[PDB]
């Protein structure tokens, strides 16, 4: 297995990956659902993106922008079956976002002026659980989504050999919702570890949770 280091400059994967993390990526030789995947950006392959592989080839992906919850129906290209997906109670996150924008780690009992407290919950997609963050005052403008020809707004059927990527910082992630699918050829590898974290956040070094 070949391993490539990457730095995380954006908050698109909060709280799983924070700005200032240096990660290791294990290059492929296929990603499973829920994998944190680094890939070459389709519109501009000179740029590398990191998102969660939320949709696999053949998946019917539906996103409710109000509840900010996903519905997945696998192997459907009159669908056959539905993937077990669960959501935990929404609770305050450790983070406050200011409104341009920036992220701060504020104590849950404290408040930051000109800021909004982000919400946190656990999303389970079949076998894998991870956290997502949501901005309580934000909601996607479905009209800005990438619309798949033949499909309704906010529903996508993942073509064979391609993937649907979504960030964990749900309201702060330029992902498959806006720019479409990620082709197999574009996949770089799977994120495995945090080798180093600058603000030094040595407590972050280890596995990805």
């Amino acid at each position: 297995f070949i391993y490539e280091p990457f730095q995380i400059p954006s908050g698109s994967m909060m709280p799983t990956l924070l700005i200032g993390d240096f990660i290791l990526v294990e290059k492929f030789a296929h990603p499973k659902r829920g994998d944190i995947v680094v890939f070459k950006y389709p519109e501009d392959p000179k740029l590398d993106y990191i998102k969660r592989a939320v949709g696999l080839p053949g998946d019917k992906v539906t996103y409710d922008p109000v509840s900010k919850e996903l519905t997945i129906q696998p192997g459907c290209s009159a669908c056959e079956n539905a993937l077990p997906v669960t959501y935990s109670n929404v609770e305050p996150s450790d983070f406050v976002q200011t409104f341009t924008s920036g992220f701060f780690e504020v104590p849950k009992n404290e408040t930051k002026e000109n800021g909004i407290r982000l919400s946190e919950r656990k999303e389970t997609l079949g076998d894998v659980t991870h956290r997502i963050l949501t901005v309580p005052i934000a909601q996607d403008q479905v009209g800005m989504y990438y619309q798949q020809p033949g499909q309704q707004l906010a529903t996508w059927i993942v073509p064979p050999g391609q993937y649907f990527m979504m960030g964990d910082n749900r309201d702060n992630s330029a992902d498959s919702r806006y720019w479409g699918f990620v082709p197999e050829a574009n996949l770089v590898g799977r994120a495995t570890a945090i080798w180093m974290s600058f603000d030094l956040r040595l407590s972050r070094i280890g596995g990805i949770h």
């Binding site: 990526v25 590398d48 993106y49 990191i50």
Partner: peptide, 6 residues
């Protein structure tokens, strides 16, 4: 290495 990932 040390490239970025957005």
């Amino acid at each position: 290495x040390x490239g970025x990932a957005y």
